[PDB]
Enzyme design. Sequence first.
Site, PDB file in Angstrom:
ATOM      1  N   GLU A  28       0.839  -1.186   0.000  1.00  0.00           N
ATOM      2  CA  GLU A  28       0.000   0.000   0.000  1.00  0.00           C
ATOM      3  C   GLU A  28       0.882   1.247   0.000  1.00  0.00           C
ATOM      4  O   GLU A  28       0.593   2.210  -0.685  1.00  0.00           O
ATOM      5  CB  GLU A  28      -0.946  -0.003   1.197  1.00  0.00           C
ATOM      6  N   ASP A  59      11.607   6.351  -0.881  1.00  0.00           N
ATOM      7  CA  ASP A  59      11.823   6.538  -2.305  1.00  0.00           C
ATOM      8  C   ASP A  59      12.676   7.788  -2.568  1.00  0.00           C
ATOM      9  O   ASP A  59      13.032   8.502  -1.638  1.00  0.00           O
ATOM     10  CB  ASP A  59      10.497   6.606  -3.046  1.00  0.00           C
ATOM     11  N   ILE A  80      -2.917  13.751   3.741  1.00  0.00           N
ATOM     12  CA  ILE A  80      -2.817  12.493   3.010  1.00  0.00           C
ATOM     13  C   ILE A  80      -2.612  11.274   3.927  1.00  0.00           C
ATOM     14  O   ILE A  80      -3.041  10.161   3.626  1.00  0.00           O
ATOM     15  CB  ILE A  80      -1.626  12.567   2.024  1.00  0.00           C
ATOM     16  N   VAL A  83      -6.518  11.400   6.224  1.00  0.00           N
ATOM     17  CA  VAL A  83      -7.848  11.416   5.634  1.00  0.00           C
ATOM     18  C   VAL A  83      -7.881  10.626   4.337  1.00  0.00           C
ATOM     19  O   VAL A  83      -6.970  10.740   3.523  1.00  0.00           O
ATOM     20  CB  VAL A  83      -8.315  12.867   5.329  1.00  0.00           C
ATOM     21  N   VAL A  86      -6.883   0.937  -1.840  1.00  0.00           N
ATOM     22  CA  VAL A  86      -6.811   1.585  -0.535  1.00  0.00           C
ATOM     23  C   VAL A  86      -5.740   2.679  -0.533  1.00  0.00           C
ATOM     24  O   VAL A  86      -4.832   2.669  -1.369  1.00  0.00           O
ATOM     25  CB  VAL A  86      -6.517   0.564   0.588  1.00  0.00           C
ATOM     26  N   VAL A  88      -2.966   5.394   1.851  1.00  0.00           N
ATOM     27  CA  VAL A  88      -1.905   5.212   2.826  1.00  0.00           C
ATOM     28  C   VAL A  88      -2.417   5.604   4.188  1.00  0.00           C
ATOM     29  O   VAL A  88      -1.716   5.486   5.196  1.00  0.00           O
ATOM     30  CB  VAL A  88      -0.667   6.069   2.486  1.00  0.00           C
ATOM     31  N   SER A  89      -3.659   6.063   4.224  1.00  0.00           N
ATOM     32  CA  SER A  89      -4.248   6.467   5.482  1.00  0.00           C
ATOM     33  C   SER A  89      -4.659   5.188   6.200  1.00  0.00           C
ATOM     34  O   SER A  89      -4.645   5.117   7.427  1.00  0.00           O
ATOM     35  CB  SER A  89      -5.422   7.418   5.277  1.00  0.00           C
TER      36      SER A  89
END
Length: 187
Positions: A28, A59, A80, A83, A86, A88-89
């Site tokens: 994810e 990265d 980010i 909220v 899928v 990364v929240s």
Amino acid sequence: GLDAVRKRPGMYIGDTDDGTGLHHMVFEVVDNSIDEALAGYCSEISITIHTDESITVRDNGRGIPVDIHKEEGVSAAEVIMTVLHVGVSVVNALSHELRLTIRRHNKVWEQVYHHGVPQFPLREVGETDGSGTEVHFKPSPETFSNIHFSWDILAKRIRELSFLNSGVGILLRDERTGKEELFKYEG
Ligand SMILES: CCNc1cc(F)cc2c1[nH]c1ncc(-c3cnc(OCC(C)(C)C(=O)O)nc3)c(-n3ccc(C(F)(F)F)n3)c12
């Protein structure tokens, strides 16, 4: 809201007992770095499995934008991470502890979360010459039952990522055993 995600996790991440959901957490995160590669700004990803069964992804992209997001009042990064609607929240919500580090505009920014809840707003903590995004998260024991990551499973899917996204080099490192492999597809 993240409250629902924590309340019925399998619905969002996958089965939380058999390792499927647990490994999905890694990919994810990794997929955002891949998106950045598809855009053309990321060439290098590294994934580290820690002795405490936590995970670091890093990265070399542009870094998540950090300026203040006004429909929220907080750094876009925090938005980010906290909220979705899928993403990364989901990972953040299901993580006991998660550290975000951004290298952008020659500055280093970080923020720490506990179960998806910010411990301080994104703050500047140093200078840098690099750029990119790093994420260190520990899966919550309250969510996943058998927290042990598999080299084999991570290796397999990384080999495919490497194979499908020509020109992205992906480094996998397991500090439990000292295994280390860089997957880049240049055959
Ligand atoms: C190791 C985890 N990495 C990671 C997680 C994540 F979770 C998001 C990002 C990420 N690494 C990234 N690297 C870059 C961006 C990024 C930066 N700038 C833009 O700008 C968009 C414009 C219009 C300028 C363009 O594309 O040219 N887009 C994405 C990024 N982000 C992913 C989402 C975002 C967001 F929404 F905050 F802007 N940044 C992420």
